[PDB]
């Protein structure tokens, strides 16, 4: 059970994450210093973004996901992100 | 056509990449300074690793992929990585 929810107040205009697509979730490439996500601390590079508020990406195209995510980030008020926590190892 | 091949001489004992799994390819989380991958330059964080030499991960479990990758990195001689180049944007 590696999925967590992360609520951000956004009282912030920008999540401060770089998201990565490839030509069932969106990968988080990096976290931009300050916040909102950096200020919260729970989301880390390599985590997979599955949902924002009630809009789930697991069956959306990457282009629609980004569009919906931006639409919601530009709405007033708090946002809830659902994240799959990654594992990492070096080779 | 966003897939490239990257040959590394490995005359290096360590690719110098952190790979990310989640509970058809393995994501590259970061690149460790020096090389081999850092020294080559073509592979970047967010890229997806699809194959090493002739062993393709697109139908393997993440745990088998990592195992096979380590096995091959510990073999003598050059290694060929097949990478899907990501796109990135900030939200």
From Swiss-Prot, chains A, B:
Compartment(s) of residence: Cell membrane; Cytoplasm, Cytosol; Cytoplasmic vesicle; Nucleus
Region (Required for interaction with FOXK2): 1-87
Domain PDZ, chain residue ranges per copy: 5-71
Post-translational note: Phosphorylated by CSNK1D. WNT3A induces DVL2 phosphorylation by CSNK1E and MARK kinases.
Outcome when changing residue 19 to T: Found in a renal cell carcinoma case; somatic mutation
UniProt-reported outcome of changing residue 27 to F: No effect on interaction with FOXK2
Subunit note: Interacts through its PDZ domain with the C-terminal regions of VANGL1 and VANGL2. Interacts with Rac. Interacts with ARRB1; the interaction is enhanced by phosphorylation of DVL1. Can form large oligomers (via DIX domain). Interacts (via DIX domain) with DIXDC1 (via DIX domain). Interacts (via DEP domain) with AP2M1 and the AP-2 complex. Interacts with DACT1 and FAM105B/otulin. Interacts with DCDC2. Interacts (when phosphorylated) with FOXK1 and FOXK2; the interaction induces DVL2 nuclear translocation. Interacts with MAPK15. Interacts with PKD1 (via extracellular domain).
Domain notes: The DIX domain mediates homooligomerization.
Family: Belongs to the DSH family.
Function recorded in the entry: Plays a role in the signal transduction pathways mediated by multiple Wnt genes. Participates both in canonical and non-canonical Wnt signaling by binding to the cytoplasmic C-terminus of frizzled family members and transducing the Wnt signal to down-stream effectors. Promotes internalization and degradation of frizzled proteins upon Wnt signaling.
Protein name: Segment polarity protein dishevelled homolog DVL-2
The species this protein was found in: Homo sapiens
Covered range of the whole protein: 263 to 355 of 736
């Amino acid at each position: 059970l590696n999925i967590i929810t992360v609520t951000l107040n956004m009282e912030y205009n920008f999540l401060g994450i770089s998201i990565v697509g490839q030509s069932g979730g969106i990968y988080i490439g990096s976290i931009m210093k300050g916040g909102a996500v950096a200020a919260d601390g729970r989301i880390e590079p390599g985590d997979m973004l599955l949902q924002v508020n009630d809009m789930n990406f697991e069956n959306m195209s990457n282009d629609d996901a980004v569009r919906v995510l931006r639409d919601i980030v530009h709405k007033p008020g708090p946002i809830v992100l659902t994240v799959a926590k990654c594992w990492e190892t070096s080779v």
